[PDB]
Amino acid sequence: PQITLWQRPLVTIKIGGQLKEALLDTGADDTVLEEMSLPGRWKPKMIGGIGGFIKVRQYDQILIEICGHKAIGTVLVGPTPVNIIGRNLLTQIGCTLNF
Amino acid sequence: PQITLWQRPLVTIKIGGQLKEALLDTGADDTVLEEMSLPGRWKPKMIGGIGGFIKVRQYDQILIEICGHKAIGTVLVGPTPVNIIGRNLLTQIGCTLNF
Ligand SMILES: Cc1nc(COc2ccc(C[C@H](NC(=O)O[C@H]3CO[C@H]4OCC[C@H]43)[C@H](O)CN(CC(C)C)S(=O)(=O)c3ccc4c(c3)OCO4)cc2)cs1
Ligand SMILES: [K+]
Numbered sequence: 001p002q003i004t005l006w007q008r009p010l011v012t013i014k015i016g017g018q019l020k021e022a023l024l025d026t027g028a029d030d031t032v033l034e035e036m037s038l039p040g041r042w043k044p045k046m047i048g049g050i051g052g053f054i055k056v057r058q059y060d061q062i063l064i065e066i067c068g069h070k071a072i073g074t075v076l077v078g079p080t081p082v083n084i085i086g087r088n089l090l091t092q093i094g095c096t097l098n099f
Numbered sequence: 100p101q102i103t104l105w106q107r108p109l110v111t112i113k114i115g116g117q118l119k120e121a122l123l124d125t126g127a128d129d130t131v132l133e134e135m136s137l138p139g140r141w142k143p144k145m146i147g148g149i150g151g152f153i154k155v156r157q158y159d160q161i162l163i164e165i166c167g168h169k170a171i172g173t174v175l176v177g178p179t180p181v182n183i184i185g186r187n188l189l190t191q192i193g194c195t196l197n198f
């Protein structure tokens with residue numbers, strides 16, 4: 001679809017058999033999700049942004065659906081205030097900025 | 100222009116008679132720029148990122164150019180690791196998501 005930005009660009013994703021709402025984030029290189037139940041093995045990792053850094057877990061090759069479009073990528077779980085879909089995923093569903 | 104997302108969406112802004120490189124961030128309610136000389140009054144204010152909170156100065160009605168398009172809005176100056184253009188401004192140059 002086409003998304004104007006007068007309202008946070010919130011979409012609906014389904015990961016690990018759960019439904020959630022992530023923010024479409026161009027400024028994010030990575031996909032970061034609040035604490036959640038995900039199967040498989042993972043890695044410790046740290047990412048940073050405004051205000052500081054946070055230690056998160058890294059999951060690769062995990063299936064995720066973003067507002068209808070399927071995609072398989074790297075999801076990072078950890079103490080982020082909101083769900084974020086980053087360019088690593090935004091790239092797969094062919095998302096783009098236009099103006 | 101249709102900015103694809105395989106590389107961070109960096110664009111050229113011009114504020115305070117100075118040129119800078121900022122990130123086009125859809126997941127950003129506000130525009131935040133690293134420390135810089137900016138004329139006019141302001142108001143202290145804290146904002147929260149993925150890592151925590153930061154105290155930034157808030158300037159209003161500050162003319163700015165993003166990739167050639169003139170816009171006037173609220174700009175926040177503070178300890179942000181990157182220059183960020185937020186939805187408050189993106190909507191001013193007609194920037195939108197699409198996929
Ligand atoms: C009250 C509270 N309100 C809140 C609001 O909660 C939010 C809401 C959104 C975000 C995401 C973040 N935005 C952001 O800091 O925006 C700020 C400017 O105005 C305000 O509006 C929203 C929060 C705040 C960027 O869009 C992506 N980032 C890159 C920029 C900032 C450099 S990153 O740090 O998150 C990131 C993500 C993934 C990455 C990465 C970096 O590097 C590699 O992968 C963070 C906290 C929290 S507590
Ligand atoms: K979905």
Ligand SMILES: [K+]
Pocket residue numbers: 061062063
């Ligand atoms: K999976």
Ligand SMILES: [K+]
Pocket residue numbers: 111112113164165166167168
């Ligand atoms: K410019």
Ligand SMILES: [K+]
Pocket residue numbers: 160161162
């Ligand atoms: K001005």
